[PDB]
């Protein structure tokens, strides 16, 4: 690919390199060597340097060179708990379980270790959304209580009748 195919292989090669465990940054020219992109266009060399390698959220500019961003990705149980806490504190929202799994290898160990601290919501497509378990105010009760509560239909009542009950019972 011209102006589009080369960058894809750079990202793929960089991702694979990190999986090996090489946190050391790599130069633009060095990465091009192992990606068989030595003949890349000059205008793409500056374009990747100025735009592709900085705008992407997985590229870290260290001492001029570029390195992966495992810090942003969750790679520890503590980071997993912290990320959810910030989401609840700032009200950012939940995160799909698949997103955590790819970012966190063996995410099952972290998820099970935290246990109830993570709230799981099952989407129609089996996707699980993780939410922080705010343990400030908790209230869990027996199942039949909700069943009786559900038995008390309220959507099929008017405001006048609902408010009339208050004076009917004397409260």
């Amino acid at each position: 690919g011209y102006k589009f195919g080369v960058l894809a292989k750079i990202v793929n090669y960089m991702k694979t390199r990190h999986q090996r465990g090489d946190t050391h940054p790599l130069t633009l020219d060095e990465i091009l060597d192992e990606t068989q992109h030595l003949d890349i266009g000059l205008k793409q060399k500056q374009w990747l340097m100025t735009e592709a390698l900085v705008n992407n959220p997985k590229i870290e500019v260290i001492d001029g060179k570029y390195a992966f961003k495992p810090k942003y990705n969750v790679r520890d149980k503590k980071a997993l708990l912290r990320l959810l806490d910030q989401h609840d504190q700032r009200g950012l929202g939940g995160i799909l379980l698949e997103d955590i799994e790819e970012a966190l290898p063996n995410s099952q160990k972290a998820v099970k270790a935290l246990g109830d601290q993570i709230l799981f919501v099952n989407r129609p497509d089996k996707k699980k959304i993780l939410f922080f378990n705010d343990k400030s105010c908790q209230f869990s009760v027996d199942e039949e209580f909700q069943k009786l509560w559900r038995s008390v239909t309220v959507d099929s009542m008017d405001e006048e009748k609902i408010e009339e009950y208050l004076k009917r019972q004397g409260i």
């Binding site: 690919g1 011209y2 589009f4 195919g5 894809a8 793929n12 992407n56």
Partner: protein, 88 residues
Amino acid sequence: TNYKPVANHQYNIEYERKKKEDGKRARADKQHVLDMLFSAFEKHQYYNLKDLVDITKQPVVYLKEILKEIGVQNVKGIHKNTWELKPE
């Protein structure tokens, strides 16, 4: 002379002969497939999965896995959701 008994229809055997001669598509190495996918990206911005299979000439399951590794699919309200070769 109509519907004369025949072991197999002439069209059916000819089609089978063509398929047998052509053979099933093989699983090319990821590097070669990736290079072909990237090279074809220049011609047009977006490709259809069925059409892309013909261009790459690879098994659908293998191609989808390779495409999923980098490529993504964008929902379009005009015809349907189609695969986009751009990873980003």
